Design a binder for this molecule. Sequence first.
Ligand code: ANP
Ligand code: ANP
Ligand code: ANP
Ligand code: MG
Ligand code: MG
Lengths: 500, 470, 469, 53
Amino acid sequence: PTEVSSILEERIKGVSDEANTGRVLAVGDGIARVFGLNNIQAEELVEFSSGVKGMALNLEPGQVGIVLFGSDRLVKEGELVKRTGNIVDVPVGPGLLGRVVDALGNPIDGKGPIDAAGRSRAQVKAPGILPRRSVHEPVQTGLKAVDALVPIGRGQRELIIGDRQTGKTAVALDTILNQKRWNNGSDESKKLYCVYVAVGQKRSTVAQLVQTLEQHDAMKYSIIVAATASEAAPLQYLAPFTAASIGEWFRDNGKHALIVYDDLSKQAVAYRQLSLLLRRPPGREAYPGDVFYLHSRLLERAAKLSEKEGSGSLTALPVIETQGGDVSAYIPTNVISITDGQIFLEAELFYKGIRPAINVGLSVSRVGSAAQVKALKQVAGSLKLFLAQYREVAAFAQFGSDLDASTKQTLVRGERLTQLLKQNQYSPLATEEQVPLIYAGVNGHLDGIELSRIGEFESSFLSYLKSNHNELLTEIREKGELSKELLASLKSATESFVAT
Amino acid sequence: STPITGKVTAVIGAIVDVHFEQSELPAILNALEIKTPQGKLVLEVAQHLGENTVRTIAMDGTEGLVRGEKVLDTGGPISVPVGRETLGRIINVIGEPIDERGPIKSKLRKPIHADPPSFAEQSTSAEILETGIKVVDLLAPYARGGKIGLFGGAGVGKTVFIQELINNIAKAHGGFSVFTGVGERTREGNDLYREMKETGVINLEGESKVALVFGQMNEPPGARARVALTGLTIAEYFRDEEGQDVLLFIDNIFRFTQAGSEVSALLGRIPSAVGYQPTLATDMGLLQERITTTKKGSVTSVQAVYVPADDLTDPAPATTFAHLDATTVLSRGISELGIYPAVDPLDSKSRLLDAAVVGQEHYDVASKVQETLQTYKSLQDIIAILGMDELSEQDKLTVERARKIQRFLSQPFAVAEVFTGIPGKLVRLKDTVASFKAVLEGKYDNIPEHAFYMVGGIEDVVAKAEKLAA
Amino acid sequence: TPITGKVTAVIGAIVDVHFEQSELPAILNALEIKTPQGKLVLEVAQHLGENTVRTIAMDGTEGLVRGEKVLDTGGPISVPVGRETLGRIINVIGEPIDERGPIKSKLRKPIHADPPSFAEQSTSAEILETGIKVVDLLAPYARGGKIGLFGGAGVGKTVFIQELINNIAKAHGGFSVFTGVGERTREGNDLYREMKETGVINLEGESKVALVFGQMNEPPGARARVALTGLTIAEYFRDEEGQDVLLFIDNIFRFTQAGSEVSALLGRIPSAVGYQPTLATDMGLLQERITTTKKGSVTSVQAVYVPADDLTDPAPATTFAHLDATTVLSRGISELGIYPAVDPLDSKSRLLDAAVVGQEHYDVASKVQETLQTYKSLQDIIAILGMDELSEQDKLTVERARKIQRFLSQPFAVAEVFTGIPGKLVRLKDTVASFKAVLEGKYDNIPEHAFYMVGGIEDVVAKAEKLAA
Amino acid sequence: QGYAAEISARRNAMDNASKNAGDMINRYSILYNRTRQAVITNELVDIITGASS
Ligand SMILES: Nc1ncnc2c1ncn2[C@@H]1O[C@H](COP(=O)(O)OP(=O)(O)NP(=O)(O)O)[C@@H](O)[C@H]1O
Ligand SMILES: Nc1ncnc2c1ncn2[C@@H]1O[C@H](COP(=O)(O)OP(=O)(O)NP(=O)(O)O)[C@@H](O)[C@H]1O
Ligand SMILES: Nc1ncnc2c1ncn2[C@@H]1O[C@H](COP(=O)(O)OP(=O)(O)NP(=O)(O)O)[C@@H](O)[C@H]1O
Ligand SMILES: [Mg+2]
Ligand SMILES: [Mg+2]
């Protein structure tokens, strides 16, 4: 508007007016050894004369050891290095919503300057024993298998683990997409803001992803934080911490965020890289000694605050990639015991058509029913145990010796239950869509219906329930609890339809 | 005031080197203090590197530390307040309160490192501590004054189990109790403190029966590596100076070994096998041997033991076995059957299972139950391959009885109501033995398998049998 | 004036150079030592402190003498870019090695350059039909995407890639950049014969492709680099001349293997399996550059080698996450004589989605996989008990899966000197129908052998009539 | 006749099962020793590297 270039030149006129340390000893491989910087803090930020920033990690007697945030072609021996006087820290506040930032919280989307309500540090003490509460709110994913079997709670940490290409990211994504149900509303305390941390992913893959978030109008309530494949090891290692703070803002301020760490296996790969190069002696599989401490302190930062503290939650879905199904390898083991349960995805399951390829056998939520919706809870009574008994009888089936009316019975139901939990990507379901499905399966109204046809049952059922008994669907939703008469209406309603 | 000063010369992660004037070094295991913007930062001297320099370990986060910063010698090991003043309070590794209820007003403090009682101070007793939990009291009964480990890989039910214990034992117990949270979930601790208040065990405006010592996984190795001794010292004090009965709850003792692991290399030690520190054996020894009944008074301890990767032969747990009077082994295989608690009835052991301690009948029932299940285990090959069909008649019955028995070993815990929605049932030790005796002689062969699952005593087997047949 | 250093140390591929005064060559810069031969190139890896740098040689260090004069060239390794390099065979150091004189380009670019930014990213979901049944059907490749062939030794990554060059590269129009990293010089000599014959390379005409070769005889510096040279060339064709570039790398493994070869001598503590501690980010810098951007599409096929046939080795494990379609070669499958020896169950693509391939192709796929996965689940019972112990439904699935399995094999024209049968190219619509029919059991009555090593469903009915005589 | 024909079949079948599981045992035995062996080397390396530093 009326020469916009003249307004930028007048505001950036007088700035350099009060700017009157160590020298570099050697530089190589993201590391710079540096003589001087006597007043420097452990973990303090430093600017190199060349521009590139770095972090002090080894304050030794003669010298300081610095990991760089950049490339190093630009750093030479003897080049002057400078104290910032600050520990690594990030912008926070709801200004981040919708933005794609790097590890230090710089826009990388193209949408211009972040507006922040303030700045947190990257490392922050987790809330103590003292200011917390029981996890009692659901974080509804809209994933049949998950919301009936391993129900996740506002405040809980829940591992997503499996091999490569199993659908780990997909579970996390489908969860985010779902929150639309509540985020387009006005009840701030039912809302769930998402933070998606991309660690070691290729850029286009973060792209391909923000596109999908937008294709689903899901970006207005998310914040992606990206430390892609090419960035410095230090940024990769840092991202989850910086991110944890971005969403700690929400928790501290009465709201609920959701942090997806995709994925810690890489953060540890990178944290291994700082250390081996800083020359700290290695632990098992060349990892550093406290690679556990690394994750433990991050994941503890997820919590559900007490009323005195604003009731804000932060919920964590870390991801972990295994090899050859081995969960007994170092890192998975570490995180497995840090979190409040896991969802195991399996390749074998996948290829035979269970998608999400959740492994019920091994997946748990340790909060359990405390975070399930009452209605879902009511009709999911015993499903998870039953599904176990089902694998039991199906293993004994391999003997191919004649079945009786008891085993054939539970086989028919387990097969149909299995099938009823299959779900297409990108389609999270409302609770009231889930509930009648589960009820139809559990109380055995599905048991006389062809297996290939259960596909069509699902949508045809829901279509009819919306059309006719919408008054139920809207009660389930509003009330979240199937009263005795509502069980009746639903009972009637299902039978009705099963006779076509 | 005669204060000793040093300066920080290095920081590498959790390791902070400090330099002092001529031959005037604080000894190993001494605490040092650094006065920081928010609170203080405690160090612990680990080595004397020479040239008037010591290697320390930090009881906190080392970021923000500046080389050349003044360090102060406290003159002795980390101190904790002790006695009845710690009752109803929550304490961190460095004997400071974290409940925001003001300062712990005790007359004495005590060093957290101390020597383990001499061979001649030991006290052997075969006394039996009734848990209420059917499988323990039948098969591997816990010993009053004993030490008692709970082995289990991740999420097989250790913490729940240990809480079920506290729910029962810690009421009927006349004396005091310490609970130590070593590297667990801040929120688990949260629950306990809110349960203690509501069980009544704690009372912030009156009398309390338990001290709380916390050092969860949200905290750096040095801290996670000493808070066991912090807790353990408080216990020690009631044992030796209140001359009385204590119950020492540690969850989870494996994190004492792990934390030891995380700084080992930074202190410059070559790794031993499975990348554990060279000092695993003796370090565990040096702690465990203090947790002990002696002539002045009795401790009884329940320590959860994390079994990494479900591998029992992992150097860490494998070492711990030698330290315990009674071993409760939780198993994923068991828990996966819906059988809670996840106790392995065969691999669980307790020294007290000896006729001399529990009587012959108890010992015979307990042995037969074991033979039963061992057979049933041995036959699971022939059951898979040739069905249940291809069996001797005695066998067919042994299996019938083994299955009925497997279930009667599960039991709804009170603590775990959130999981079963089933009310907590507690069973008396005599009721345990009688019902298993009955089951074993066939005086119950007609009742269906489900009637034994997730119920209390044989009353409940009959009650359920009929309620279901209805 | 010239900046000259002195050779202080030689250890394998590493040379240490001391520089007299203040101005130390930047990290990544080229250095030159004059030989009786021509000259030796060096790449400044790190500043050791005290006016000494440590370099990696781009060639052999035989005959180097301590104290030697070393010339600083004041820039990264340079390579001729643009249309001038088409049909020329190039170095790691961007030189002509096709005995055909100077590559007279306008510009020389550094091999080292930062990967395209996040704002500069650009995605799309367009299929690229290949004529290969297993791929076409199961893990569809994407135009302007990143494809990778995984496999151990002699499973056929090279021959597979030559089938892709065969189909796509002919009817592509735009520019190709083939890069031989750590492969056989025989193969590279063969590929130069192969092009002059199809006319892709026309010594007297125009040319559609470019050749860059740091082969398996090269020192680890050469091989740690030659792919970056290839890339720079492609990146020009993409960003400057806004072109569709086909970019074949073979073998990209050989870049990370070279990284480890030098790494200890660079003074680094090793990492798991004895790899350079930087293995992930050194790959991220290189892989993140091979990409489509808002300025030009790049489709790239890369050959991935798999050490010791272990897929979880840290080199390939880390690769995967950089690709858009991943297609794996099983040794076992080749020992069945099934070619291409793809793993129908391990191969993946982002493009197998109903929104892209459509409900039917989507479903013909899944159902094929369920069938194969079931066969796989039973591999044990059949191994001990054999077929007679399977039920009826199971029994069928196996006979069907064994047919689907043989049908996934396809004669390749390039591999003709190994089958004998002249190679076939099936189409996408062709493949889906064909498989759907089999999955509707419309061919159950045909001997399993008919499905082996033939084209589309028509060829099955042919061979079965031939054999039923 | 049917039973005595079946018993013959059961015998012959079970017989081949023993031959196969026999041959399988052989394979896995070889695989076992490999894994054992490497477990020793990879475990050892972890120490050597920890030790040089
Ligand atoms: N419910 C589903 N139905 C069909 N396909 C799915 C489903 N969930 C995931 N997938 C697909 O499987 C492919 C890989 O899934 P993805 O969600 O990336 O798992 P992942 O463990 O994150 N793989 P990666 O992280 O790249 O190693 C994607 O192409 C998805 O389309
Ligand atoms: N008695 C029980 N009844 C029902 N479920 C149980 C019982 N004990 C444990 N569980 C289930 O197992 C889960 C883990 O229990 P928990 O005691 O936290 O395992 P854990 O071994 O202590 N975890 P960790 O401390 O990391 O080793 C819970 O969320 C419960 O669902
Ligand atoms: N599609 C195919 N048809 C027929 N034979 C094939 C095919 N693919 C591989 N082979 C055979 O397997 C051999 C190795 O194939 P090749 O393309 O050299 O594989 P490679 O895995 O790239 N080997 P290498 O490059 O040394 O690690 C060839 O000699 C072919 O005979
Ligand atoms: Mg993923
Ligand atoms: Mg626990």
